[PDB]
């Protein structure tokens, strides 16, 4: 258990000082773990999220979320952790925001003061 918190702190560390940040992030893991410790069934919490699925459409996906928790019976504390954390018109509206987020990301640099967006001039 003293190591399973050390391997967890490695995965969430984004790859590239990577030798002292792990030492400081292990503090944020412990500084936050003991705040809750200082201070209801399991399957019901899924259904309350299954309901909110069906309301906004996408019925079969909600009929799948219940299909797996029924076979996961034949571990309960694991799913209790997960719950804590026009088809064409959307296509033409995606490939149009790209051309709005591609000509903007590069015109904001092409027209500015000489040497702002350039990293070599910042040396």
């Amino acid at each position: 258990i003293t190591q399973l918190f050390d391997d967890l702190c490695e995965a969430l560390l984004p790859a590239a000082n990577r030798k002292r940040a792990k030492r400081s992030l292990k503090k944020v893991a412990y500084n936050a773990l003991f705040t809750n410790l200082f201070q209801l069934p399991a399957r019901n919490k899924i259904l309350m999220l299954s309901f909110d699925l069906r309301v906004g459409g996408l019925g079969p996906k909600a009929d799948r979320l219940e299909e797996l928790v029924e076979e996961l019976e034949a571990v309960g504390s694991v799913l209790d952790l997960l719950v804590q954390l026009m088809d064409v018109q959307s296509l033409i509206s995606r490939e149009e925001c790209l051309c709005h987020s591609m000509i903007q990301e590069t015109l904001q640099v092409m027209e500015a003061a000489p040497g702002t967006g350039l990293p070599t001039v910042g040396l």
């Binding site: 088809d87 064409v88 296509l91 033409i92 509206s93 490939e95 051309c99």
Partner: protein, 121 residues
Amino acid sequence: SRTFLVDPNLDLSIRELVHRILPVAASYSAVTRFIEEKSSFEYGQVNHALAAAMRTLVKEHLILVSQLEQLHRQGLLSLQKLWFYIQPAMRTMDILASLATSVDKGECLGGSTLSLLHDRQ
């Protein structure tokens, strides 16, 4: 096998690109005629369900043209932007326009229409 005519007096920088979009229409005017004909009973119980399952894609091709006109009203649809949007349709309506021309070439009905779909994203 449809032929088209564009314009005597048009910009050459357009006609060369127009001829790049039409091959999805000519490949469409040969699928919609395959549905309205191979649906006749005198063609077996296979050349029917082949024409039905070949119709749902035509429905989804009509939605892709609707979402373009609604996106055309805001003017966000330039000609260059069009050539990229229909690319999923230029590949699919190029597959079906090849089966619908290879099932009618050699008259197939029944099993010989189920073999061709096993030899032919």
